[PDB]
Amino acid sequence: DVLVKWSEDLANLPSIDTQHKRLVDYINDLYRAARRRDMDKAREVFDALKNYAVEHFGYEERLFADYAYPEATRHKEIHRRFVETVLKWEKQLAAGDPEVVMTTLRGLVDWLVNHIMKEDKKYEAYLRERGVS
């Protein structure tokens, strides 16, 4: 059905969950397109994923600034570094085929799931206390 199922340990603030769920959905759409050997669709999905990640990082960072999250600086750098990675992957998909998409999923899933589980989880308690959700 899907490559990445939504497990309960990924849970965070309600609003944050709506965006993280979108990212996971994009990953699954990307996998399905690659599995179908539909490269045109794969590139379109990756494009949407790319755009959404950039927007999502902005959303989190806005909250960090608004409520003075202590680890905002380190977290922002982590986001920026991933955007660089995504832009590199974009070029590889532009020149490659579905096999390249699958290979890319290895690093894409590893980074996203780990980021949500480790780095993003660190701001939940802090933000909740400040009236965020």
Side-chain angles (χ1 to χ4, degrees):
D1 187 59
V2 299
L3 177 61
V4 183
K5 286 189 171 190
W6 182 268
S7 53
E8 293 309 298
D9 54 351
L10 297 179
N12 201 297
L13 302 174
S15 65
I16 286 294
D17 280 3
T18 69
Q19 307 207 333
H20 286 167
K21 184 61 170 54
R22 286 280 300 279
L23 287 167
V24 172
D25 287 347
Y26 276 130
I27 287 179
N28 291 319
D29 296 321
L30 186 56
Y31 171 69
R32 289 194 288 277
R35 180 177 64 182
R36 285 186 165 184
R37 197 74 182 186
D38 185 350
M39 198 57 187
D40 284 348
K41 180 63 178 182
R43 292 170 183 150
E44 292 172 3
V45 173
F46 189 83
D47 184 73
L49 188 165
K50 162 202 175 188
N51 291 345
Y52 196 78
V54 171
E55 293 290 358
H56 170 63
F57 293 162
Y59 182 79
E60 287 188 355
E61 286 162 33
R62 293 158 183 169
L63 292 178
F64 297 167
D66 292 356
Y67 300 89
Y69 174 53
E71 292 306 310
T73 299
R74 289 180 176 297
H75 201 130
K76 181 179 293 187
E77 182 186 341
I78 289 174
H79 284 171
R80 294 298 185 74
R81 282 174 177 283
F82 185 60
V83 173
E84 298 175 65
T85 300
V86 170
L87 294 174
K88 163 183 161 296
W89 283 331
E90 176 177 37
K91 295 182 180 296
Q92 297 186 313
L93 267 67
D97 67 7
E99 281 183 50
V100 172
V101 177
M102 294 301 277
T103 298
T104 298
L105 283 170
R106 188 180 276 116
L108 184 59
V109 178
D110 179 61
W111 190 92
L112 175 61
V113 175
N114 176 76
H115 185 72
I116 289 173
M117 287 187 58
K118 291 183 174 58
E119 306 298 349
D120 287 347
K121 193 65 173 61
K122 295 179 177 176
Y123 63 57
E124 178 177 21
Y126 181 85
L127 293 179
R128 279 185 183 286
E129 289 177 48
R130 303 307 185 299
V132 186
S133 53

PDB file of all heavy atoms in Angstrom, residues 99-122:
ATOM      1  N   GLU A  99      14.636   4.321 -11.432  1.00  0.00           N
ATOM      2  CA  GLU A  99      15.602   3.647 -10.571  1.00  0.00           C
ATOM      3  C   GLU A  99      16.307   4.673  -9.695  1.00  0.00           C
ATOM      4  O   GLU A  99      16.628   4.403  -8.538  1.00  0.00           O
ATOM      5  CB  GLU A  99      16.624   2.873 -11.407  1.00  0.00           C
ATOM      6  CG  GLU A  99      16.099   1.545 -11.931  1.00  0.00           C
ATOM      7  CD  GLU A  99      17.150   0.758 -12.693  1.00  0.00           C
ATOM      8  OE1 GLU A  99      18.268   0.586 -12.161  1.00  0.00           O
ATOM      9  OE2 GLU A  99      16.853   0.307 -13.819  1.00  0.00           O
ATOM     10  N   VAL A 100      16.548   5.855 -10.251  1.00  0.00           N
ATOM     11  CA  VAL A 100      17.198   6.922  -9.504  1.00  0.00           C
ATOM     12  C   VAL A 100      16.242   7.422  -8.422  1.00  0.00           C
ATOM     13  O   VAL A 100      16.665   7.791  -7.326  1.00  0.00           O
ATOM     14  CB  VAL A 100      17.592   8.092 -10.435  1.00  0.00           C
ATOM     15  CG1 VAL A 100      18.078   9.282  -9.615  1.00  0.00           C
ATOM     16  CG2 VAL A 100      18.681   7.633 -11.395  1.00  0.00           C
ATOM     17  N   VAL A 101      14.949   7.426  -8.727  1.00  0.00           N
ATOM     18  CA  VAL A 101      13.963   7.871  -7.750  1.00  0.00           C
ATOM     19  C   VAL A 101      13.966   6.932  -6.547  1.00  0.00           C
ATOM     20  O   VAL A 101      13.948   7.378  -5.401  1.00  0.00           O
ATOM     21  CB  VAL A 101      12.537   7.911  -8.350  1.00  0.00           C
ATOM     22  CG1 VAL A 101      11.534   8.309  -7.274  1.00  0.00           C
ATOM     23  CG2 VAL A 101      12.482   8.901  -9.508  1.00  0.00           C
ATOM     24  N   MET A 102      13.995   5.628  -6.810  1.00  0.00           N
ATOM     25  CA  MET A 102      13.994   4.648  -5.731  1.00  0.00           C
ATOM     26  C   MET A 102      15.234   4.773  -4.861  1.00  0.00           C
ATOM     27  O   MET A 102      15.153   4.716  -3.631  1.00  0.00           O
ATOM     28  CB  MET A 102      13.899   3.236  -6.312  1.00  0.00           C
ATOM     29  CG  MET A 102      12.574   2.959  -6.998  1.00  0.00           C
ATOM     30  SD  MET A 102      11.197   3.175  -5.853  1.00  0.00           S
ATOM     31  CE  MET A 102      11.211   1.586  -5.055  1.00  0.00           C
ATOM     32  N   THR A 103      16.384   4.949  -5.500  1.00  0.00           N
ATOM     33  CA  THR A 103      17.639   5.090  -4.775  1.00  0.00           C
ATOM     34  C   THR A 103      17.581   6.333  -3.886  1.00  0.00           C
ATOM     35  O   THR A 103      18.059   6.325  -2.750  1.00  0.00           O
ATOM     36  CB  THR A 103      18.816   5.192  -5.761  1.00  0.00           C
ATOM     37  OG1 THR A 103      18.895   3.979  -6.522  1.00  0.00           O
ATOM     38  CG2 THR A 103      20.127   5.412  -5.024  1.00  0.00           C
ATOM     39  N   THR A 104      16.979   7.395  -4.412  1.00  0.00           N
ATOM     40  CA  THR A 104      16.836   8.654  -3.685  1.00  0.00           C
ATOM     41  C   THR A 104      15.935   8.494  -2.460  1.00  0.00           C
ATOM     42  O   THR A 104      16.167   9.113  -1.423  1.00  0.00           O
ATOM     43  CB  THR A 104      16.249   9.746  -4.604  1.00  0.00           C
ATOM     44  OG1 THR A 104      17.153   9.983  -5.690  1.00  0.00           O
ATOM     45  CG2 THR A 104      16.033  11.043  -3.838  1.00  0.00           C
ATOM     46  N   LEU A 105      14.908   7.658  -2.579  1.00  0.00           N
ATOM     47  CA  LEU A 105      13.981   7.426  -1.477  1.00  0.00           C
ATOM     48  C   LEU A 105      14.688   6.926  -0.225  1.00  0.00           C
ATOM     49  O   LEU A 105      14.251   7.191   0.896  1.00  0.00           O
ATOM     50  CB  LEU A 105      12.901   6.425  -1.896  1.00  0.00           C
ATOM     51  CG  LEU A 105      11.793   6.979  -2.794  1.00  0.00           C
ATOM     52  CD1 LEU A 105      10.942   5.835  -3.329  1.00  0.00           C
ATOM     53  CD2 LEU A 105      10.940   7.958  -2.008  1.00  0.00           C
ATOM     54  N   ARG A 106      15.782   6.199  -0.417  1.00  0.00           N
ATOM     55  CA  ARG A 106      16.549   5.671   0.700  1.00  0.00           C
ATOM     56  C   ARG A 106      16.994   6.827   1.606  1.00  0.00           C
ATOM     57  O   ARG A 106      16.771   6.801   2.816  1.00  0.00           O
ATOM     58  CB  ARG A 106      17.759   4.894   0.171  1.00  0.00           C
ATOM     59  CG  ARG A 106      18.538   4.130   1.223  1.00  0.00           C
ATOM     60  CD  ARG A 106      19.730   3.388   0.617  1.00  0.00           C
ATOM     61  NE  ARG A 106      19.393   2.078   0.054  1.00  0.00           N
ATOM     62  CZ  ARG A 106      19.503   1.755  -1.232  1.00  0.00           C
ATOM     63  NH1 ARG A 106      19.937   2.647  -2.113  1.00  0.00           N
ATOM     64  NH2 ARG A 106      19.207   0.525  -1.637  1.00  0.00           N
ATOM     65  N   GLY A 107      17.603   7.849   1.013  1.00  0.00           N
ATOM     66  CA  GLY A 107      18.053   8.990   1.793  1.00  0.00           C
ATOM     67  C   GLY A 107      16.930   9.927   2.206  1.00  0.00           C
ATOM     68  O   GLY A 107      16.979  10.547   3.271  1.00  0.00           O
ATOM     69  N   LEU A 108      15.915  10.040   1.361  1.00  0.00           N
ATOM     70  CA  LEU A 108      14.776  10.905   1.642  1.00  0.00           C
ATOM     71  C   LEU A 108      14.021  10.424   2.883  1.00  0.00           C
ATOM     72  O   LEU A 108      13.758  11.197   3.809  1.00  0.00           O
ATOM     73  CB  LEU A 108      13.839  10.925   0.434  1.00  0.00           C
ATOM     74  CG  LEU A 108      12.619  11.841   0.481  1.00  0.00           C
ATOM     75  CD1 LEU A 108      13.061  13.285   0.666  1.00  0.00           C
ATOM     76  CD2 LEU A 108      11.831  11.690  -0.815  1.00  0.00           C
ATOM     77  N   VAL A 109      13.674   9.142   2.903  1.00  0.00           N
ATOM     78  CA  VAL A 109      12.948   8.580   4.039  1.00  0.00           C
ATOM     79  C   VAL A 109      13.784   8.611   5.315  1.00  0.00           C
ATOM     80  O   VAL A 109      13.287   8.969   6.385  1.00  0.00           O
ATOM     81  CB  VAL A 109      12.509   7.124   3.753  1.00  0.00           C
ATOM     82  CG1 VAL A 109      11.803   6.536   4.968  1.00  0.00           C
ATOM     83  CG2 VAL A 109      11.588   7.100   2.549  1.00  0.00           C
ATOM     84  N   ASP A 110      15.056   8.238   5.208  1.00  0.00           N
ATOM     85  CA  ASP A 110      15.927   8.234   6.375  1.00  0.00           C
ATOM     86  C   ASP A 110      16.015   9.613   7.010  1.00  0.00           C
ATOM     87  O   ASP A 110      15.939   9.744   8.226  1.00  0.00           O
ATOM     88  CB  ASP A 110      17.336   7.753   6.008  1.00  0.00           C
ATOM     89  CG  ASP A 110      18.290   7.761   7.202  1.00  0.00           C
ATOM     90  OD1 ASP A 110      18.029   7.047   8.197  1.00  0.00           O
ATOM     91  OD2 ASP A 110      19.309   8.483   7.148  1.00  0.00           O
ATOM     92  N   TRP A 111      16.169  10.649   6.193  1.00  0.00           N
ATOM     93  CA  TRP A 111      16.276  11.989   6.749  1.00  0.00           C
ATOM     94  C   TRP A 111      14.969  12.483   7.354  1.00  0.00           C
ATOM     95  O   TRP A 111      14.956  12.949   8.493  1.00  0.00           O
ATOM     96  CB  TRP A 111      16.741  12.999   5.694  1.00  0.00           C
ATOM     97  CG  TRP A 111      17.083  14.324   6.308  1.00  0.00           C
ATOM     98  CD1 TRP A 111      18.313  14.734   6.737  1.00  0.00           C
ATOM     99  CD2 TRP A 111      16.169  15.377   6.646  1.00  0.00           C
ATOM    100  NE1 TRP A 111      18.222  15.973   7.325  1.00  0.00           N
ATOM    101  CE2 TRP A 111      16.919  16.392   7.283  1.00  0.00           C
ATOM    102  CE3 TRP A 111      14.789  15.559   6.473  1.00  0.00           C
ATOM    103  CZ2 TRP A 111      16.334  17.574   7.752  1.00  0.00           C
ATOM    104  CZ3 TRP A 111      14.207  16.735   6.940  1.00  0.00           C
ATOM    105  CH2 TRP A 111      14.983  17.727   7.573  1.00  0.00           C
ATOM    106  N   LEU A 112      13.874  12.367   6.604  1.00  0.00           N
ATOM    107  CA  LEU A 112      12.584  12.854   7.081  1.00  0.00           C
ATOM    108  C   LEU A 112      12.075  12.178   8.342  1.00  0.00           C
ATOM    109  O   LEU A 112      11.726  12.847   9.311  1.00  0.00           O
ATOM    110  CB  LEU A 112      11.517  12.732   5.990  1.00  0.00           C
ATOM    111  CG  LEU A 112      10.109  13.119   6.467  1.00  0.00           C
ATOM    112  CD1 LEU A 112      10.099  14.565   6.932  1.00  0.00           C
ATOM    113  CD2 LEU A 112       9.109  12.918   5.349  1.00  0.00           C
ATOM    114  N   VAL A 113      12.016  10.853   8.335  1.00  0.00           N
ATOM    115  CA  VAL A 113      11.522  10.148   9.509  1.00  0.00           C
ATOM    116  C   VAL A 113      12.373  10.458  10.733  1.00  0.00           C
ATOM    117  O   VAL A 113      11.845  10.709  11.821  1.00  0.00           O
ATOM    118  CB  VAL A 113      11.482   8.627   9.268  1.00  0.00           C
ATOM    119  CG1 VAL A 113      11.085   7.907  10.553  1.00  0.00           C
ATOM    120  CG2 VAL A 113      10.481   8.309   8.165  1.00  0.00           C
ATOM    121  N   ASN A 114      13.690  10.452  10.558  1.00  0.00           N
ATOM    122  CA  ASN A 114      14.592  10.740  11.662  1.00  0.00           C
ATOM    123  C   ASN A 114      14.431  12.177  12.153  1.00  0.00           C
ATOM    124  O   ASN A 114      14.459  12.438  13.353  1.00  0.00           O
ATOM    125  CB  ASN A 114      16.040  10.515  11.234  1.00  0.00           C
ATOM    126  CG  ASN A 114      17.020  10.886  12.314  1.00  0.00           C
ATOM    127  OD1 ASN A 114      17.191  10.156  13.291  1.00  0.00           O
ATOM    128  ND2 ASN A 114      17.665  12.035  12.156  1.00  0.00           N
ATOM    129  N   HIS A 115      14.265  13.111  11.223  1.00  0.00           N
ATOM    130  CA  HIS A 115      14.112  14.510  11.596  1.00  0.00           C
ATOM    131  C   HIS A 115      12.846  14.721  12.417  1.00  0.00           C
ATOM    132  O   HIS A 115      12.860  15.408  13.441  1.00  0.00           O
ATOM    133  CB  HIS A 115      14.052  15.394  10.348  1.00  0.00           C
ATOM    134  CG  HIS A 115      14.021  16.856  10.657  1.00  0.00           C
ATOM    135  ND1 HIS A 115      15.098  17.567  11.139  1.00  0.00           N
ATOM    136  CD2 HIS A 115      12.995  17.741  10.584  1.00  0.00           C
ATOM    137  CE1 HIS A 115      14.701  18.830  11.339  1.00  0.00           C
ATOM    138  NE2 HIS A 115      13.431  18.983  11.015  1.00  0.00           N
ATOM    139  N   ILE A 116      11.751  14.131  11.954  1.00  0.00           N
ATOM    140  CA  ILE A 116      10.475  14.250  12.644  1.00  0.00           C
ATOM    141  C   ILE A 116      10.548  13.602  14.022  1.00  0.00           C
ATOM    142  O   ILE A 116      10.108  14.181  15.015  1.00  0.00           O
ATOM    143  CB  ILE A 116       9.346  13.582  11.830  1.00  0.00           C
ATOM    144  CG1 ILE A 116       9.031  14.422  10.591  1.00  0.00           C
ATOM    145  CG2 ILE A 116       8.100  13.419  12.696  1.00  0.00           C
ATOM    146  CD1 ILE A 116       8.049  13.770   9.638  1.00  0.00           C
ATOM    147  N   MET A 117      11.120  12.404  14.077  1.00  0.00           N
ATOM    148  CA  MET A 117      11.235  11.660  15.327  1.00  0.00           C
ATOM    149  C   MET A 117      12.202  12.231  16.352  1.00  0.00           C
ATOM    150  O   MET A 117      11.933  12.191  17.555  1.00  0.00           O
ATOM    151  CB  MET A 117      11.648  10.216  15.043  1.00  0.00           C
ATOM    152  CG  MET A 117      10.565   9.352  14.449  1.00  0.00           C
ATOM    153  SD  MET A 117      11.083   7.630  14.343  1.00  0.00           S
ATOM    154  CE  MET A 117      11.436   7.293  16.057  1.00  0.00           C
ATOM    155  N   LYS A 118      13.328  12.752  15.882  1.00  0.00           N
ATOM    156  CA  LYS A 118      14.345  13.279  16.780  1.00  0.00           C
ATOM    157  C   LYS A 118      14.361  14.787  16.984  1.00  0.00           C
ATOM    158  O   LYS A 118      14.120  15.269  18.091  1.00  0.00           O
ATOM    159  CB  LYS A 118      15.735  12.826  16.315  1.00  0.00           C
ATOM    160  CG  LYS A 118      16.007  11.334  16.463  1.00  0.00           C
ATOM    161  CD  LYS A 118      17.433  10.999  16.037  1.00  0.00           C
ATOM    162  CE  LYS A 118      17.781   9.540  16.312  1.00  0.00           C
ATOM    163  NZ  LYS A 118      16.856   8.589  15.633  1.00  0.00           N
ATOM    164  N   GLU A 119      14.648  15.529  15.921  1.00  0.00           N
ATOM    165  CA  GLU A 119      14.744  16.979  16.010  1.00  0.00           C
ATOM    166  C   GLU A 119      13.432  17.713  16.257  1.00  0.00           C
ATOM    167  O   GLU A 119      13.365  18.576  17.129  1.00  0.00           O
ATOM    168  CB  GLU A 119      15.413  17.529  14.746  1.00  0.00           C
ATOM    169  CG  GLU A 119      16.767  16.890  14.444  1.00  0.00           C
ATOM    170  CD  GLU A 119      17.797  17.130  15.535  1.00  0.00           C
ATOM    171  OE1 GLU A 119      17.547  17.960  16.435  1.00  0.00           O
ATOM    172  OE2 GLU A 119      18.869  16.490  15.486  1.00  0.00           O
ATOM    173  N   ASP A 120      12.394  17.383  15.496  1.00  0.00           N
ATOM    174  CA  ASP A 120      11.112  18.063  15.671  1.00  0.00           C
ATOM    175  C   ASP A 120      10.440  17.753  17.002  1.00  0.00           C
ATOM    176  O   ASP A 120       9.757  18.603  17.569  1.00  0.00           O
ATOM    177  CB  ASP A 120      10.141  17.717  14.541  1.00  0.00           C
ATOM    178  CG  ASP A 120      10.496  18.387  13.224  1.00  0.00           C
ATOM    179  OD1 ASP A 120      11.337  19.319  13.191  1.00  0.00           O
ATOM    180  OD2 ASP A 120       9.903  17.975  12.208  1.00  0.00           O
ATOM    181  N   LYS A 121      10.626  16.535  17.499  1.00  0.00           N
ATOM    182  CA  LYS A 121      10.018  16.137  18.766  1.00  0.00           C
ATOM    183  C   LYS A 121      10.527  17.007  19.918  1.00  0.00           C
ATOM    184  O   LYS A 121       9.812  17.243  20.893  1.00  0.00           O
ATOM    185  CB  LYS A 121      10.326  14.663  19.054  1.00  0.00           C
ATOM    186  CG  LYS A 121       9.498  14.053  20.174  1.00  0.00           C
ATOM    187  CD  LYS A 121       8.019  14.002  19.797  1.00  0.00           C
ATOM    188  CE  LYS A 121       7.204  13.236  20.828  1.00  0.00           C
ATOM    189  NZ  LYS A 121       7.272  13.861  22.178  1.00  0.00           N
ATOM    190  N   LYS A 122      11.759  17.489  19.789  1.00  0.00           N
ATOM    191  CA  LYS A 122      12.387  18.319  20.811  1.00  0.00           C
ATOM    192  C   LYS A 122      11.673  19.633  21.109  1.00  0.00           C
ATOM    193  O   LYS A 122      11.836  20.188  22.193  1.00  0.00           O
ATOM    194  CB  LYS A 122      13.832  18.636  20.420  1.00  0.00           C
ATOM    195  CG  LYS A 122      14.758  17.435  20.357  1.00  0.00           C
ATOM    196  CD  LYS A 122      16.151  17.874  19.927  1.00  0.00           C
ATOM    197  CE  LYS A 122      17.129  16.709  19.909  1.00  0.00           C
ATOM    198  NZ  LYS A 122      18.466  17.123  19.395  1.00  0.00           N
TER     199      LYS A 122
END
